[model samples]
Target chain A: QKILQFEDIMTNPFYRERFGTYMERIDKRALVGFWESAEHLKNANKSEIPQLVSEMYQNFFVESKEISVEKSLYKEIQQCLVGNRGIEVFSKIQADVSEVLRERYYPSFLVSDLYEKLMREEE
Target chain B: SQKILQFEDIMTNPFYRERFGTYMERIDKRALVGFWESAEHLKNANKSEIPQLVSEMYQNFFVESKEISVEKSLYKEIQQCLVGNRGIEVFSKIQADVSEVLRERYYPSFLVSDLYEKLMRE
Candidate 1:
């Protein structure tokens, strides 16, 4: 279960360094979390890859335009769960994000850059 | 320490985590259960974006109009904690220190908005 499709993308030493500051701050135990997480996906049904990749990518890198999409996705996910929604919704709007990757047009995560933008807006 | 102290200076939620935690534990068991289920759902959602959404939801409720650079700063803190290279003794001490501040300041207050009306009605 240690081979999630995106582990290669995320654990390219680039992201570990980008997202590893706090780990380094606390002793930098090891960048094995995502490694282990990738293992977890190895067992998941492959048909779920599109959803999985999009879901995984959403966190590590969300474009500014996509942030609004995330908001909508979250609302859709949250708005109607009245303890029951019957499981008929996904890719709400952001669902097809992974589909665009085939066109080689996915936005890069740029962690510190995105972090700066978020923080600047916060200020 | 510098930035943390600034958060303290502003009284920008000195014991917020403990406050919300205790509120959920002592008063609103139902609310705590809801969070528990939501946490479970996100973990199973199997996405790297879970943390972002978690932060977004919490901040949306508490920090809409307020300006604070907490999220990015805490990102570092959380990553450090995730590795957990720090000592358990230190963890306990940190918890104790936070508890001490709340006890001494008599803080970590209830987060219930309805408490105002409920108390007045009572």
Candidate 2:
């Protein structure tokens, strides 16, 4: 019966402020967006897939310190870029990022003061 | 809230308390709990995860072989829903149905128990 609405978590000012602060520390890069972009590969053109894959690597692995992509996997992904086979590596990347967010960031979100306050408001 | 309080009050009787515990354990064992946790809370869940979510919810609570499962005919509707980009909606609706089924299966038994009668008399 205690359903936490996703909209309220993202929108309510009180919850939103705490959520923003928490994310600032835990997921400063908002790698969730990176994850979404990877999902788009399912519908992306072969030509477009490589560019998206390259951008994902550049944005998340190369630039962001939020997540560390393995060098060996990184090299393999780059190799796939040549023949538009970049789609092959995306499933692993997506799963790895999903685990990071789901296991690392999400647990804190659930246990945080923001979640406590939002849930209380429902009462 | 008052009903829950009354239920707790009635739970002072060991027999009814055990029954309540059994009911709760059954619920805890159900996939509905995890499904709700994921459906409502998983912040970064994207389109890619929706297919997995849909299938798991379907198998856990909507499969034809499950005694508590919904009408067999709705399976086709669920399939058709998956054809569009409405996986989230489909998952959410299935969750709602599962919640309803849990309530229907357990709440009435609690209401009819001696615990409820004891609370009513008080």
Candidate 3:
């Protein structure tokens, strides 16, 4: 799905121009380097790919606080899966973790509903 | 070639229209699954005081010590990424990815701790 979408953008003249313009405004060196690294990892063995991707993601999170919570949460969820916990257990762990953060960050909002609903779907 | 549109103008452009349409469609799908309700009230939110309102809401609902601690940790991680590792360029991409995942999953409140754990793990 992603490949097709990217190909569509690349093939469209307007999208190509827009994408080029967007890239021009960004740090080209960094962007190119990141893509190069990703491409290199793509050709590597599956066993090596996850670690590489994880490192890149971690590096991204370390540099960008805006994504810290979400990235960290994703990592934890992945771990729960590896620990032999079923989807239910994984959802419960996630809900508990989110509650802790909400208490600290969004104290007055009743987010229990949010957590509960997410967990219920795990079943 | 004509000068590219600035950020504000881009918001009104066809690309943004497409993206917004896709985003709304995703939200509608999620709503159909009974995980969330459409908070149309937010559409009528006062633009001028939106930031202040958000801050107030944060203060009212997000006052736990654990929450503060995690935020602090996240801040520290950002500092390390930017200052220690010179990863300034990946900031926005990471932020967007994180936001998208969070909204799509509607992760439970308890998942915050798990988030912290995963962040620290790798």
Candidate 4:
């Protein structure tokens, strides 16, 4: 079974407030289902796992209003496949996802804050 | 979970130095000053009038970056995003990021003589 990938929610201010926490709990259940289904497919000499995961994430988009939020969650799930090494995987994914969001959304205050943070981090 | 390292790596790579350089050239001080001025005007403006002011500024002054010109689809996507109340926020943020990037990264690489030479070449 894949370990819980919790760190993906860290960068999501909206998720941190309310929706994210609930979604994370739901995602954990989904992960468990993924592992079980994956094992079943493997034993049957089938590769339904990829399709299964894709379908599940697609369902997330249908269920979620905020496309960004859904995309972030799916990204977090993809990151979990990297051997469950939380910090290494999450940090990289977080940076990648956040950049996409920033580029797409172009939230001026947030971008300004990110730039300031990057400068501080570089220092 | 699959960790996507592509975006993270590219953003940090020194190879992006030139791309970032181009980004700075496109997002000039004029844009930043314009936003700052608009924001100041917004402070004194009636709340209802703010959106119109923002929209006018965005339409009049939101020039596409040179680098973005190469990627027409992406430029369109950015342009589409730069509308409405949400667009206003995004535009302001982009300006802030551009300013920060200039102060931290581009200013050092910027050479007036080299720029003049390039201008002459073009």
Best by DockQ: 3
| Candidate 1 lDDT over residue span B1-122, tens digit each | 11122222212232432332343344333233233333435446655665565554344421231222222323332233222222222223333333333233211121122332333343
> Which pairs clash (backbone N, Cα, C closer than 3 Å) in model 1?
A1-A39, A1-A40, A2-A38, A2-A39, A22-B80, A59-B49, A91-A95
Per-residue lDDT for A21-85 in model 2, tens only? 43444444233333334445456665664456556545654466231222222222222221332
Looking at model 2 chain A, report the run of 10 residues with the lowest lDDT sum: A67-76
Residue A102 of candidate 3: its Cα lDDT? 34
lDDT of 4: 0.34
Tell me the tens digit of each residue's lDDT in model 3 across B72-115.
32343333333311332333344344434433432232134343
Error of 2 at B47 (Å): 48
**Candidate 2: residue A117 Cα off by (Å):** 61
Per-residue lDDT of model 3, residues A42-78, tens digit only: 4667566545655755543344333334343333333
A1-123, model 4: which lDDT tens digit per residue?
A: 122122332223432223223334434323222223333333442354445434433432233223232222322322222223323322333344345433642334223433334345434
Better of 2 and 3 by TM-score: 3
Q: For residues B1-122, could you state the per-residue lDDT of candidate 4 as single tens digits?
A: 22222433424454432233234335442333233334445446776775466445433332321111111212233233323333334323433333343335333333232432343343
lDDT of each: 0.31, 0.37, 0.35, 0.34
Tell me the DockQ of each model, to 2 decimals. Answer: 0.02, 0.02, 0.03, 0.01
Question: Candidate 1: what is its chain A TM-score?
Answer: 0.25
The alpha-carbon RMSD values of the candidates against the true structure, listed in the order shown, are 26.6, 24.7, 23.0, 26.0
lDDT of 2 by residue, B34-115 (tens): 3333334333467566545544433443232222222122333323333333432332343344334324543344344444
